Amino acid sequence: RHVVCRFPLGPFCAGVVGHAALPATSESPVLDAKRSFLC
Amino acid sequence: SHTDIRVPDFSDYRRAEVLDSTKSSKESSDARKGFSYLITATTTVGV
């Protein structure tokens, strides 16, 4: 395991949808999970 | 709040074939469009 995807807390999974050119970027565990349950 | 809204009933204005909420409109679509377009075509013939 030699990638920022190894840390799955959410590597900023900030990719944008596309077809024939979809650019994606990732950083590292980003939190933002399970706070969405409450406003 | 978007969930709260429910479309007001239009049964008073609805055509007889589509009055029921339990039947598909696909069966009656041709009949309804046929009535309206028959009105239109006869009007155009007179014109």
Partner: protein, 435 residues
């Protein structure tokens, strides 16, 4: 190996039925991890106005506690195993699936059985989840896409259960009680209406025996599409969301494949797409060149006997009319003057989407459960490929004409939709005077 040989080599899905009627299906892919879940034929469409929000409420309280493992014991066990417990509720289906290592399949199946059958509903937990659900109903107004799609369902299926939203009205959420939630669970969480599906390292015999061990102790109207529009105009909202649809075939109808090919032909677009002007889809090319649309997508939502077929586009206040014109023009061109090459491109796109989605143990389990509920069978990829191959330009034109030409649309709007064409103009766009 050719693509057809790879399709033939795909492992088969094995379906078995317990005495209670629960259908156990599994696909063994020889992977360290597996996904197991229970897909239940329950949802909003089976709920009356009194109990519209019951299913979402039960899904909220599903993992909160169970009688056998009270409170967080279920969560603690699942987390200690390393598994992920997830659930989704839709108008027609509700699912609870656990992602876990293949070795942990027995405990995962036991937990799923506990959640489905022996789910305690403590009034305190019910009140807490009621607070949570009301706060989420407040939050969900932010998601313009969900709001517009709920509007589309409300207007398209007005007067029918399918119009009802999954979350349910706030009043029902406030007035729901433990008794009615338990009644909903009893009425709809029945063994004949549930499917146990697993994909990964599971062995069908092991899954079947575990289901016998745990799931054995269990019990042994077509909607009307109305051509109508809902317009909520809020100029403050930065962008306008519009969803337009016509009635589509249900799950069973074979026409779904050609319609999906046509929707692939129409395509999808977003401002961050990199193709831009050179994108194959004419509507996408026009949107990119003219900057008409921030995002645009075609959907083929299908229910048991009816479905919604159309597109959803996000536009600026001044671009709604042109985008509507171009989208309806694409539909009409498909109805009238579809061509072989674009049909081939759509068929390839549909094949790629079908194959890519099934990649993943969780998508495979989702497909197994939802197909068993919707079709009664798991359609092999080879059958999908054959049906896709049968589609041609004539078939696409015939299907689009059947479902698109001179058909009353269902339209929903949100935001600065002042330039959204009047329903008469939109309807007139659905037919061509030249044709």
């Amino acid at each position: 190996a050719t693509y057809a040989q790879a399709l033939q080599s795909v492992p088969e899905t094995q379906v078995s039925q317990l005495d209670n009627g629960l259908r156990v299906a599994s696909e063994q892919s020889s992977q360290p991890t597996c996904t197991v879940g229970v897909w239940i034929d329950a949802g909003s469409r089976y709920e009356n106005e009194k109990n519209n929000g019951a299913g979402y409420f039960v899904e909220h309280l599903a993992f909160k506690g169970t009688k056998n493992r009270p409170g967080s014991a279920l969560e603690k066990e699942v987390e200690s195993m390393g598994a992920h417990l997830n659930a989704y509720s839709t108008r027609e289906h509700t699912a609870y699936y656990i992602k876990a290592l293949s070795k942990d399949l027995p405990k995962a199946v036991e937990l799923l059985a506990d959640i489905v059958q022996n789910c305690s509903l403590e009034d305190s937990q019910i009140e807490k989840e009621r607070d949570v659900i009301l706060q989420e109903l407040q939050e969900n107004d932010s998601s313009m896409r969900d709001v517009v799609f709920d509007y589309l369902h409300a207007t398209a299926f007005q007067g029918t259960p399918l119009a009802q939203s999954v979350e349910g009205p706030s009043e029902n959420v406030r007035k729901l009680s433990r008794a009615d939630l338990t009644e909903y669970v009893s009425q709809h969480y029945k063994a004949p209406r549930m499917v146990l599906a697993a994909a990964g390292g599971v062995e069908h015999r092991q899954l079947l025996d575990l289901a016998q061990k745990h799931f054995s102790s269990l019990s042994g109207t077509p909607c009307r599409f109305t051509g109508s529009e809902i317009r909520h105009r809020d100029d403050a909202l930065p962008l306008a969301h519009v969803a337009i649809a016509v009635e589509g075939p249900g799950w069973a109808n074979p026409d779904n494949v050609p319609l999906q090919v046509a929707n692939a032909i129409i395509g999808h677009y977003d401002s961050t797409y990199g193709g831009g002007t050179h994108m194959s889809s004419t509507l996408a090319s026009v949107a990119a060149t003219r900057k008409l649309c921030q995002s645009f997508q075609t959907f083929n939502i299908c229910y048991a006997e009816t479905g919604l077929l159309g597109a959803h586009f996000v536009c600026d206040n001044m671009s709604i009319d042109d985008m509507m014109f171009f989208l309806q023009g694409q539909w009409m061109r498909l109805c009238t003057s579809a061509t072989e090459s674009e049909v081939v491109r759509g068929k390839n796109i549909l094949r790629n989407a079908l194959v890519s989605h099934l990649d993943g143990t969780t998508p495979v389990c989702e497909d197994i459960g939802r197909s068993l509920l919707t079709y009664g069978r798991r359609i092999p990829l080879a059958e999908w490929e054959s049906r896709i191959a049968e589609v041609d330009a004539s078939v696409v034109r015939e299907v689009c004409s059947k479902y698109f030409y001179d058909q009353c649309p269902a339209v929903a709007g949100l935001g600065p939709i002042e330039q959204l064409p009047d329903y008469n103009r939109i309807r007139s766009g659905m037919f061509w005077l030249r044709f």
